[PDB]
Symmetry: D2
Subunit: 484 residues, 4 copies
């Protein structure tokens, strides 16, 4: 048996854009992401799959079923987001000097919030309140995230930017987005504080800037390849996090965190340990040192950035193998996320439907490194596998949950594990083919089915432990019967 503390919670995470649509009446056409996946040129180029999110799992209409299943599964925590575009589908009056690089302060008060109130979509706010009330009535502890990638179209036209036209709404390249984000977050906290337990400002901001402006083959908006603009987007996102933090704290006393995409960086040979550290600096610490210690880049300390974080949401799937170079370090293909789909890595480890390598030890690595650097408590806010057949998921689930136990045992303050995800959903540029659910979705009927891994998770959650009977699943899925 591997027993968790009595206060530890098991649950799940999901995103508005990936899961909301699918039931008639749920359509939200007003985001950069909506426009982006319907774009004819993006489709012809294969940058997006051609699948459309309005044919999704339909959480907007069917949330009661989702919560029903989650309760039967013994889950006690959930992390969701509100979609910005649903609440403010229409542009807000211009507020503020747009040419200033830094946004050190955004003044928000009772009067300003009441003014915003008059622009807000009331049907959308009331519907979210209905969803969250039903969530809370199942005994689910609620982490509310403000941002999980789609921006209102009135703040970002991604096709214009893709085309190299910077005269329109430019998303994270514009301090106007920073300013409005802080206000949105204060506003939502103001409206929903009575239901919320903890807050997250944003989900994986590193992926937004990284795939948006460098990893353009990913088909993420706006898909404009520029090292310079990628840095600008990340700089603005950092400030937006700090201002959203201050905004929420002006209205609520509850914990405010952030959710971030992590890999476990691993040395190719024992000569590559420095390369691991440089990779950790460049992919992780630089960002967290900014919003925790105020350290940013000349290398300065910004007092408006310092201390703006109460907890860390750890998202984790797999490792990245690095080696030392003359000029620095490189990542290696054939490991981590750079493998063949439904095959084996260069290390002989099985890969998912998405080509991601099975490497649960990485999670222990990531949890304990954060803990040793910052001493902030953590949730595992995302962890899971693309696996429609359910072959690897039982092993994936138990192995990762074990590593969390390992992390706690070593002293790290980790307070919950939230699987990605409760049900299948729309996997961004990849469409519906990448199925991460504990529950399978038949997209024709929106009916949910329990994969055997869901029954395994029920065992874990109901008992607050990896029980004796399922302990063998803390191992690598046998590769011999699997595709190579």
């Amino acid at each position: 048996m591997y027993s968790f503390p009595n206060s530890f919670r098991f649950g799940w995470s999901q995103a508005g854009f990936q899961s909301e649509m699918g039931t008639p009446g749920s359509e939200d056409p007003n985001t950069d992401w909506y426009k982006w996946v319907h774009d004819p040129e993006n489709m012809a180029a294969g940058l997006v799959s051609g699948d459309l999110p309005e044919n999704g799992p339909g959480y907007w209409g069917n949330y009661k079923t989702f919560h029903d299943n989650a309760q039967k599964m013994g889950l006690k925590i959930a992390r969701l987001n509100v979609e910005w575009s649903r609440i403010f589908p229409n542009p807000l009056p211009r507020p503020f000097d747009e040419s200033k690089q830094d946004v050190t302060e955004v003044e928000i008060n009772e009067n300003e919030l009441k003014r915003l109130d008059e622009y807000a979509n009331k049907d959308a706010l009331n519907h979210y309140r209905e969803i969250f009330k039903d969530l809370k009535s199942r005994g689910l502890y609620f982490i509310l995230n403000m941002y999980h990638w789609p921006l209102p179209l009135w703040l970002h036209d991604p096709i214009r930017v893709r085309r190299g036209d910077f005269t329109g709404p430019s998303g994270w390249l514009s301090t106007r987005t920073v300013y409005e984000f802080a206000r949105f977050s204060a506003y939502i906290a103001w409206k929903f504080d009575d239901l919320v337990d903890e807050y997250s400002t944003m989900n994986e901001p590193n992926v937004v800037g990284g795939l948006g402006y460098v990893g353009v083959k990913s088909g993420f908006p706006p898909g404009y390849l520029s090292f310079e603009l990628s840095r600008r987007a990340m700089y603005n996102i950092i400030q937006a996090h700090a201002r959203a933090y201050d905004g929420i704290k002006s209205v609520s006393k509850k914990p405010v965190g952030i959710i971030y995409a992590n890999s476990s960086f691993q040395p190719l040979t024992d000569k590559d340990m420095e390369a691991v550290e440089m990779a950790e600096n460049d992919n992780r610490w630089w960002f967290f040192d900014a919003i925790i210690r105020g350290e940013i880049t000349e290398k300065i300390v910004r007092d408006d950035l310092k201390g703006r974080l109460d907890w860390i949401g750890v998202n984790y799937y797999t490792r990245t193998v690095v080696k030392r170079t003359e000029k620095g370090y490189v990542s290696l293909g054939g490991y981590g996320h750079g493998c063949e789909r439904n095959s084996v890595s260069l290390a002989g480890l099985p890969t998912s439907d998405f080509g991601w390598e099975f490497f649960p030890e990485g999670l222990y690595d990531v949890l304990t490194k954060y803990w040793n650097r910052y001493h902030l408590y953590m949730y595992v806010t995302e962890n899971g596998i693309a696996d429609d057949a359910d072959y690897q998921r039982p092993y994936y689930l138990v192995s990762h949950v074990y590593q969390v136990h390992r992390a706690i045992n070593s002293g790290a303050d980790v307070r919950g594990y939230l699987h990605w995800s409760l049900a299948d959903n729309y996997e961004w540029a990849s469409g519906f083919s990448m199925r991460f659910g504990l529950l399978k979705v038949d997209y024709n009927t929106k009916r949910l089915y329990w994969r055997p891994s869901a029954l395994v998770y029920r065992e874990i959650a109901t008992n607050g432990a990896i029980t004796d009977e399922i302990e063998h699943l803390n191992s690598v899925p046998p590769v011999k019967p699997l595709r190579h």
Copy 2:
């Protein structure tokens, strides 16, 4: 939902030789099969794996744990056998003309049973009583089978026979074995009737004669290749069944059946339907027409054979594809049981760790054909898959259970489904590598673990139905992620 009748029972089947040994004190060295798998020449030839049954799962010592798990799984029926060799390890006095071909009668009465009593091993009888009492106390309905392949060494020395020496104890080639089998079965019924619900005389007698004397590459005792001796063994086994039936009925009023190995015979092309019928005649009907209608081979009717059956135990794994020949019919490799391990058949269907093709429709075929010919009620007494990883079993389980539902819906009287098996066990000449358990066995510690399929079976059994939530598993395991 697929709901079964309120009286339908879900459970499991297991064999004494495959599951009993493994705990110190359980060793039974006195069978043909024990001798056969320890034989140095058999080992060097690769006819047996080299694995030894005394290193098994240890049901003899650990039966309470097995039954505990079965109860938690919601099972309500079990079929086991007593091992003949445990009860009579030593030769019994010669009774009876050994050169007579037919055994039409074996006289058994109270006095003869008391005489046998004085030869019986009392420790073994008392231990079995303890096992079965504990079984019944979990609310398990009990089918007791008399014979599941091992014969006492004093009735069969398989190495002598393998060597072409017929002067020793010759197993099913000798009417002495028939005579003693009838007495053993009456004796066991006499001892255990208060605990037993239904009886089976024997398990898969067709496999005993077929692999014993024709399919000699299987490594079944005595491994002497002879069409003639295979017929002789089957003739004696048939008579032994009829005499065991009469023996049990002299002592008990309870239902007496038999458990038999079935394939579903399928035509290669639509020109091969007659070939299917000939295959069914040669592999199935000839045997059942003997013990039900007394029809045997000149083609006669034996009154001592007629009507000796109350129910049919249907064992089923996969299909056999046949085609018409000039001289008759042939079976095709690349389908059914003749496939590559962990691969796909010639029809693109996934195969097991044993190379057996996924074909659940065959079970409906087999159930309804028996029903339409004889109108005897049936149990599915064996059905399962060699699958250590648990990749295919959830699908295999739900799909086959569905076909049973299909059979009932069409009118067939089927009263239970017994999965092969509750836990991993010693798979004959193949050893421990073929793992059929709903529970995984760690052979070092004898600890049992729940594979995700066990949690799926708990759903089925507790509800008496394939529930809505697991209904997607009534499909073929996706082949793309699997080895080809």
Copy 3:
């Protein structure tokens, strides 16, 4: 036995950029493609592999060895290009009598005086080196098809990074009529200089891939990688008129045959209800182009016109072929299906159970017969198979790939098609564009460390074919699908 006419030639095709560099002093940094593959942002995005052409097979210095092996192998035809950038590495003077705002280029006047001026700007070392290569070529008895263009443009004509970034103020490649004007002049110039060595001309290699991958299929990492339906059409329009202007230019200086080389797939119906889908696909991917440069039929804005300056500008068709495309009828028209043709997994099997190559291309030789006979029946121009081959480092499938496709050409001739040679892609491994060196198409293996060439068993098979002018009885079993059971699925 499958015998070819006595005049039919077996050989190979090769491209300057893919094969020239690798030997000391061979480097040509002055193309869009060179800049494109060295670009740090393109590298970080994985648009390009990170392999660099300057570490290539070194034909620039080792051409005598290549030619030696090709002669040993009994080859009798070769098709090569001159790299524009090596001849004119620096810009030429903005031309007289030229309006950059005019959509159409109906004429480009080139005379002996203009040619003599151009000659002042040409790199003489490059010109002399190419003469040395081609002389050596002809000395082995190889018939020579000289192609003018095989993708890289001089940087002074195209800065692809600028265009990638959405900046159209600089040199914009096929988006500019200046490039059309200069291409015409370049082709006339090369013909004027090399006509004593050339047997037949091609203007261009696969223009449809340049426009298509450059401006629509941007995940392929082709320059300038700017996603735009509108700009893809403009590039294709300009490339069409460039072909016509180049044909006139070559004809002003030469009597020899002038063709074009084009990328083809065989369009195949998913079900028997999809035959119209195939015809629409053939219209959109093939006929529209050739009806323009043969029949002068084209669309400019919104109208279907005939341009007398485009009509009749083709003497022969270079058929490039690898695999099929499976199409199905839609409400809005037709779509291609993944899991067939070039959209399969690498080293696997297609949805039809046919083996795929290192590049994920489906084995489908019957498509070649389909393509050759369709071109024949529509236009009645003679053709060459100018590119056919497989990415196969291990040499598992190539022996089958080669014999089978060569059989399909024999079948095409038998049906009446005028097909005059077969040219394998390629003699030796080379630099496969954005994919780098890992895609190995050679009959000969290249060790990139030593630049040594090795005969794959397929090269020995090809020698049998070429020396005999036939698929001989002894190798005829190779006219079949590589067995799939021993291969990866």
Copy 4:
């Protein structure tokens, strides 16, 4: 370049039973093997495949075509056997001065008079046909190694079904000294008849496989398939004395070199603690046999003796080699491991990640060097590589298999070993015993419907090797492991 001595020969080996039948009038129903493979019970048990040798490649009638192709391929040596059963299809008179109960056969007197008597019983059509085959062989410049025995015994000497059934009252094959006596006479007889055509002799092909698979490895479906450690030893004991008696018999009539051909694997240690395990394996599978027939050392019942009638009966060693065997130390001795060598899955990869053949045999060329040099250092007798090859219908791995093993022979010579030729198994596909026709080892493919031979690309590779007496620079990259990524795992 890897060059061989000017006297080294490249060729092939072939067996009568596997290759002769298939043409009208070639049938030879009079062997244990023939009866064994037609047996209904053996068929139903799947001990034999159900394929029949009379539908084979037809060397009996088509030998001129085989020889034609072998000469085209530049081969210069061949090793064939005569089938005993074709020469003596009927029993011979029970012999004078012979006690069937004696364990040892120390002498078999054969003189000219006895030979002339035997000649009265020999089938003359068979003898003349073999002369015609061998004359044609020699006329292509092939050096001829004639082997006396390659597994089938005349039925009058062995009824395998009777023995399978445990009935030892009939003709019992290698379990009877009568078979030893007759083999000696047969070999002297064949030498007496064919010595003008023969260059070197072998008595036997792989006697260890006959005894081993016949009496222990019974799942292999070899005759008589009677499982007995004791009878395997008796068969091997008799086969050893048969070899000695045959050597004396041949020497009574011929001056030429007389050797034996033997099945070898390379024993390899699982871990570095297993080197003694390897030596014990080499003792039990190899040295015990050769110490008997070279040094006269043997065990009879319970004692280690020297027999002067066994000592020195060998002039050369025929090395047969396919793959390795991995062994590990046990308390009781040593064991072989599955997942390496010949115990792998077909068309897959071994536990060491090395590719396996259609037969499930692991690619391990370094084992050949190990085997050749071990024999050399122990006995200092010259050797031939008499069997080496791969079951590979598609020809994917064979080009690598061939070049790599041929390299390992070059390495053996370089180290000092006297190795005088390499003979591929085999020229053409044939009947692979209990496996039937599906295991295809030919450099040439056989279509069993027409009996036509086809050159696999490996045959072209072999022609390069043989005509040059070298692995040439051009094919030297084949001295490597077939890439596993494109193959089935």
